[PDB]
Amino acid sequence: TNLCPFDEVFNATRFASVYAWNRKRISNCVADYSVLYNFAPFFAFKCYGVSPTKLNDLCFTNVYADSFVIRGNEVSQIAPGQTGNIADYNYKLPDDFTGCVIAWNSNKLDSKVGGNYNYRYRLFRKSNLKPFERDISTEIYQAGNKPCNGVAGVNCYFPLQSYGFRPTYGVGHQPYRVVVLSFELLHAPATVCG
């Protein structure tokens, strides 16, 4: 009967950068999703496989909750099967993803008049990613021609990049926080219900 925390996932100050998204193994709950409509008017609340109007009365199992923060015009790459620099290098959902993608505007929280140089993404990599797997290693990207011997600059590139997140950018570049729930629905024990 104890409502397991969505507030420590949603209503938190620090959201992690997109190359290391958080994982909160949420289980043994009696979870009701009435709290999700009070916190913010959502920019994009899309679900895949279950409708939001019947989302309360099911009974899930192995529900995950992730968290990161990305740009404005590339929040639509957090979806099954999209292609870009986000969905191949930082966060890829599988093609049979069956949860819900929540993303609201957060320009007041995560934007300075100086450069908010904490939120970073990975831009260059050897190959693409598997679904649901992140890379946090900061080894130098080879440009493909000759070895750099761990030297940044020419013949190579430093694999990360920073966001600006200034309020004078506009709606396309101010930061959006993204919470993506991942139900692995219809298995045996079914510990989470409503």
Partner: antibody, heavy 125, light 107 residues
Framework: EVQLVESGGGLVQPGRSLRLSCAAS????????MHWVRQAPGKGLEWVSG????????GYADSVRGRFTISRDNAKKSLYLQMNSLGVEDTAFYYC??????????????????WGQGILVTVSS | DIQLTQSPSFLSASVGDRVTITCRAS??????LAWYQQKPGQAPKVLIY???TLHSGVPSRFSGSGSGTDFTLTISSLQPEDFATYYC?????????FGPGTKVDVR
């Protein structure tokens, strides 16, 4: 609620050194920032120092620049301010003040939310 | 850097009156400014952040307005607990600086 107890205040002589301390209890310390603000007995408020969630961006005022140094230690839920080469003008109540947003002054949602009781460090001798 | 000035420097208002306090900066700081209140002998507390949004716990009679360089703080119905001084605080960038102070005494 929010409980911020501070210690280290005492009568000292000019030219000495001392370390201020501030414990925290009742919130998540590493997610919120911290600052220090002093208030003279005759004057108003004046911002002393500021630190980030992980000491990423720290800045001081131009008056106490160099003489003071802040540090963050998330293990003990504590806060440290070290003052060196004090003058007679620094007799004030130092409030260990909890910020609200994660990092600093620039973000719109910044407000010095909870303020400690404050301790007087009086240096005249 | 940035300098904050307050006008007026003193007031004397009775119970039920309306008070306006002004606050100006040397440049445009773009709404990143707060307002605080200190009764003598205790700790200060938050009233309004970003000049238009109140913090939780205080009543809704408190309100601020304005943007750009000049800011106003007004209370429609003054109360006997509100007899204290009020400080500005700018929040554009480091270093943070405050206002000189305007106190509210009895009339």
């Amino acid at each position: 609620e929010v409980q911020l107890v501070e210690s280290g205040g005492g009568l000292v002589q000019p030219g000495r050194s001392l370390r201020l301390s501030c414990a925290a209890s009742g919130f998540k310390f590493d997610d919120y920032a911290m600052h220090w603000v002093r208030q003279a007995p005759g004057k108003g408020l004046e911002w002393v120092s500021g630190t980030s969630w992980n000491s990423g961006t720290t800045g001081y005022a131009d008056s106490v620049r160099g003489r003071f140094t802040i540090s963050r230690d998330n293990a003990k839920k504590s806060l440290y301010l070290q003052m060196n080469s004090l003058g007679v003008e620094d007799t004030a109540f130092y409030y260990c003040v909890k910020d609200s947003n994660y990092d600093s002054s620039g973000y719109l949602i910044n407000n010095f939310d909870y303020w400690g009781q404050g301790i007087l460090v009086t240096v005249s001798s | 850097d940035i300098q904050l000035t307050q006008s007026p420097s003193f007031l004397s208002a009775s119970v039920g009156d309306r008070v306006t306090i002004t606050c100006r900066a040397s440049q445009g700081i773009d709404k990143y400014l707060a307002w605080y209140q200190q009764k003598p002998g205790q700790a200060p507390k938050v009233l309004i952040y970003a000049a238009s949004t109140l913090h939780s716990g205080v009543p809704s009679r408190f309100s601020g307005s304005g943007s750009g360089t000049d800011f106003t703080l007004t209370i429609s119905s003054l109360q006997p607990e509100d007899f204290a001084t009020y400080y500005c605080q700018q929040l554009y960038t480091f270093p943070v600086t405050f206002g000189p102070g305007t106190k509210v005494d009895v009339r």
